[PDB]
Amino acid sequence: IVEGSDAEIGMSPWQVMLFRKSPQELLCGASLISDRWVLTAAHCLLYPPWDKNFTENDLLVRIGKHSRTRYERNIEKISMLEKIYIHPRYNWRENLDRDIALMKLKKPVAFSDYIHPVCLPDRETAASLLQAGYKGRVTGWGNLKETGQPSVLQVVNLPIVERPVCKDSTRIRITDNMFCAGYKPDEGKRGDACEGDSGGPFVMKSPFNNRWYQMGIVSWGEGCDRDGKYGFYTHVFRLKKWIQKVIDQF
Template sequence: MYSLKTYLTGLLLVTLQSVVISQYDGELCFHQKKGVNGVCKILSNCPAAITDIRQGIYPQNCGFQGTVVVVCCPQTSTPKPVGEKCKEACKKYEELGYRKEFAPVLVSNAVQKTQICPWEPQAVPTIIGGTKATRGEFGHMALVGYGTIGSHEWKCGGSLISDKFVLTAAHCLYARGFGEPTVVRLGDTNYTDPTDDQYVQQVAVKKLYKHPEYSAPEHYNDIALLELEKPLSLNQYVKPACVYTKTSTIKQALITGWGTTENRTTSDYLLKAGVTWFEPQICNNTFLNDRRTRLALLGLNHKSICYGSINSNKDTCQGDSGGPIQIYATGDYYCTYYVFGVTSFGKKCGFTGIPAGYVKVNAYIKWIEDIVWP
C-alpha cells in the first residue's frame, strides 16, 4: 500500500521534470480511468482520491494551486429521487410537534417512550362549520403581510415547509395598493390579541419565487415560495408541515385560515373546517367562463383540484388565498400535517355547494425541492 507522503514525493519529482497544464480548483474535469465527470479539487478535499492513493492507485491530476496538489475528483453521487428531500425534511421536523415522556420499564433497565401530541389528531376531518384551531395545531400556518413595519395588512396565507421557506400562491406575490409581500407571521392563533405574542415569530421576506409557468390573471400554476430573511426558531408552535408527494386523490381534508367567514366578516382567530373533494366536472361547471377565476380556456387541469361542502357553507375565501389544504399524516408521521394543496381561486364565500380551487402540490415537487433543498 502507498502512503500520501510517497505519492506526493513522486508527484513533485515528475512535476520538476515536465511541463504541467493546470486546471484550477473548482473547474470541471473528466476522469479518464473511471469514465465519469468530475471537479478539480485540492487533494485533501477529495476522499475518493485519498482512498485510491492508499490502494496504490495514482489519482488523475489537474495541476497545482501554489504547492498544493489539485486532482480530478469523480462525481459519483446519485441524485436523490424526486420527493426524497421532502420526506427527509418531514422526518427531521416531526418531533417538534409533540413531547416525549419516559417511564421505567419493569423488565430490564430500558425506558419506555410515550409520544404525546398536545392537540387531538383528526385522521378524518369531522368539523362542522368554522372551529377555532388549538395553539400549535397548525404550526405551519403563516400570515403573509404587506406594507411597512407597524402597518402591515395580512392579505394572504401560506404554509411553512422549512425553517426559511413558506409555500403560498403566486397571485399573492402582489397585492393591489400594497405591492409585494414584506413579512411573514407564524405561531399565531389570534393576530389581534397581544397576549399570545410570546409564541409568535415575525420575519421579513428576503426573496420571492414565482413558478415560471404562472401568468396572471390566470390561476394555472398558481404557486410560489417566499424565502425568509433568516431561519425561524422551530418549536412546538412554529413547525413546518410535510409536503405531500403522493398522487392519490384525497376525499376529505382540512382547510385553515383567518379569511372571510360565512357572515362575510374577517376572523381574528385561526379557524379550521372539514371539506370534501368535488368531481372536476362539477368544479368546471362552477368556474368555467368566470372572469375572476380565468379557467375559461382549459378548465380545471390535472394540477388543480376542488374542495368544498355540499351541505354546509364551508370553503376558503379570498382572505385565505395561498393558505393550505391539508390532512393529518396518519400512519406516516406523528402529530404532523401534510399540505397537499395551495388555495388558489373561489367564486363566493360561504355559499353551500360552491367549492374552492387549489393547486396540487404534488405536481410541483421537483420545483419546490430545487429551491428549498438544493
C-alpha cells in the first residue's frame, strides 16, 4: 500500500495472508468469507509468465494478523488448504480477466476479536454502493512504494473511478469483471495498492445495515501511485454466481 497508514488492531478481521511454506515468504493478501473459505486473486496461485503455479501443499493461510513478519502467538491462526478452486475462465494470458479463486481450509477457524468474515455483496448493495466517487478501502502488507515493506498492515481509502476514465488510462483491455479506483491527478490526494497487495480485499461499509462488504479483490496496476493511473480490481459481484456454485458443491 502506497500513501496508506498503519491499521488499527481488529480493523480488518477478515484480512488473510497467503504464506509460502518454503521458502517462508509472503505471497499475497486474501480474505475470510466464512469459517472455512478464503477468497483471493487467481493470479496469486497461477501465473505462467512468472512460472507461478501453487498447489494446496505449497501454501499456508495466516488469519488474524497485524504484524507482517512476526508469528503472532495466541492471536493469529495458521491454516492448511484442503482444495484450491480457480475460476475456469480466468485469463492469465491477456488482461487477468476473472482473476478470482477460492481456497477451502482443512479445518474451520474459530472466530475471535481478530478473526471474523466479511460479507459478499448482493444485487442491491452492489448497485447502491458501486458508484464512481464512492470510496472503498484496501488493505495489505505490500510494498509501500515503487512503480519498502511495512511492519504492520496498511490501509488506504480510495474512490471508485468512472469506467471511461479507467479505460483511457491504460492500453490493457478492460472487461466488465473489473473496476478501477484511485484519485485523479487534480484531486490532491494519493494512495494505491502495490506489489504484495494482490489478492487483498476492497471493502465498503453499507450505510443501510452497517456491515462491511467485499466489493473487489486487488488485481493489477501499472506502477504504484502514478498520476493518471489507477488500480484495477476483480468485480466480486459480477462473479458471485461462480462463488455460490463452488461453495454449493464441494
